[PDB]
């Protein structure tokens, strides 16, 4: 398999760029037909259940895609089962001879290594998990148990399992001695960074996907251009302006990607506009990136506007420290922002205590409040202090 599940979810929701609906519909009927996985062609009906812009035409004629038939049938199913049942007969025939011989621990472990990849390519999920239990007892060195972690990670990316896959990811990477081995630490900067996008982390994910080595090519799982795209996602949250001009802008890893593919408009247009603190050029790059980056990606569109709210409050905080008192009409004619839309932008933050700002509507001016105060820091310790005392009192009375 390639990319695991991406093209299947590209047709879930698309706001603009209808031409991508045809390419995404032709890819899902290509790779699945070329690969050996029987059931993954059937799941196309269950994935789009209760969704807007469904690409499945059965009882719903509202499909806007050019190819409206994803539905499972028996024509492709019979063709895929003939190739799956023929190869499993040859694999079980050769491996059974090695089980009775029992010569060395390599042939016993390698027999289940080819199976762990085979049961994943024939569409067996729970059956492939049982193959790891037999290969675990046949493991030789620490590297043999690492291949078990790959099977858990590969099979866990289909349904995006953040519990068993994420927990067993750090268990294999630790074991007794962690070390600087490339089969663990490098995969820790990739597999663990994927789970941070589903749990809305943006902190620990910025310490791996952003600052790392120059390759991290996983082939079938992820590519180089895919991982480099998320570098600008988590890099705009934790990393301040000091690290944006070093590990993002001036980093040589992202300099070669800008001159190669200019259609991203994320690591370049958004970073230059944010570094210059110019809202005039910062606005048009928000809609272009949201449409062609956040929406198509599976780990982004799940956030989408949730991630957009974090980018807007970043530029409003930078300009807030650049002046004390400024007229509302002066800023409207400077950065090219409307007066009506200005009240709605600041209305989703100030009442939430995200940004401290004062606006006088009599003279039409905006002021600057104190960004950091001693009492504002102690208010956070009230919830953290009472949050701990709640567990000590509740769990203390439970065990008695």
């Amino acid at each position: 398999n390639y990319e695991v599940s991406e093209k299947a979810f590209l047709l879930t929701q698309s706001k603009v760029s209808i031409e991508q609906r045809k390419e995404a519909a032709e890819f899902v009927l290509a790779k699945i037909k070329e690969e050996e996985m029987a059931p993954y062609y059937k799941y196309l009906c269950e994935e789009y259940l209760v969704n807007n812009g469904q690409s499945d035409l059965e009882h719903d004629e509202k499909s806007d895609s050019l190819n409206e038939w994803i539905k499972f049938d028996q024509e492709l199913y019979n063709e895929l089962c003939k190739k799956n049942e023929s190869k499993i007969k040859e694999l079980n025939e050769k491996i059974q001879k090695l089980e009775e011989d029992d010569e060395g621990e390599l042939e016993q472990a390698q027999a289940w290594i080819n199976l762990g990849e085979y049961y994943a390519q024939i569409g067996d999920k729970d059956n492939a998990e049982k193959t790891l239990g037999k290969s675990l007892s046949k493991a030789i060195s620490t590297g043999a148990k690492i291949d078990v972690m790959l099977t858990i990670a590969r099979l866990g990316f289909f349904y995006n399992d953040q519990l068993y896959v994420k927990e067993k990811l750090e268990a294999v990477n630790s074991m007794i001695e962690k070390g600087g081995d490339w089969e663990r630490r490098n995969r820790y900067k990739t597999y663990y960074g994927i789970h941070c996008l589903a749990v809305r982390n943006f902190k620990e994910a910025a310490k791996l996907l952003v600052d790392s080595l120059a390759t991290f090519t996983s082939i079938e799982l992820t590519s180089y251009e895919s991982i480099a795209t998320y570098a600008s996602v988590t890099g705009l949250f934790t990393l301040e302006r000091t690290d944006l001009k070093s590990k993002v802008i001036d980093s040589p890893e992202l300099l070669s990607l800008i001159s190669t593919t200019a259609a991203l408009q994320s690591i370049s247009s958004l970073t230059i506009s944010l570094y210059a603190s110019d809202y005039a050029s910062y606005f048009p790059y928000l809609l272009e990136t949201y449409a062609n980056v956040l929406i198509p990606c599976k780990y982004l569109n799940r956030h989408a506007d949730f991630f957009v709210r974090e980018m807007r409050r970043k530029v409003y905080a930078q300009l807030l420290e650049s002046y004390k008192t400024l007229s509302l009409k002066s800023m409207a004619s400077a950065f090219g922002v409307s007066v009506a839309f200005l009240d709605n932008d600041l209305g989703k933050f100030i009442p939430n205590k995200q940004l401290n700002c004062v606006i006088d509507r009599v003279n039409g001016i905006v002021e600057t409040n104190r960004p950091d105060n001693k009492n504002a820091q102690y208010h956070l310790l009230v919830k953290q202090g009472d949050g701990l005392l709640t567990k000590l009192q509740k769990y203390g009375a439970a065990v008695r």
């Binding site: 606005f283 048009p284 928000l286 809609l287 506007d305 949730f306 957009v308 709210r309 090219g336 922002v337 409307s338 839309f341 709605n344 989703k348 939430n352």
Partner: peptide, 27 residues
């Protein structure tokens, strides 16, 4: 999910593109 995922957003969709209308006319 504090003050974010519960109320979602439900804004800044068609109003974001509408901002370019007043920018390319009054100017």
């Amino acid at each position: 999910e504090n003050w974010d995922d519960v109320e979602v957003d439900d804004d800044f969709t068609n109003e974001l593109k509408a901002e370019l209308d007043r920018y390319k006319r009054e100017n």
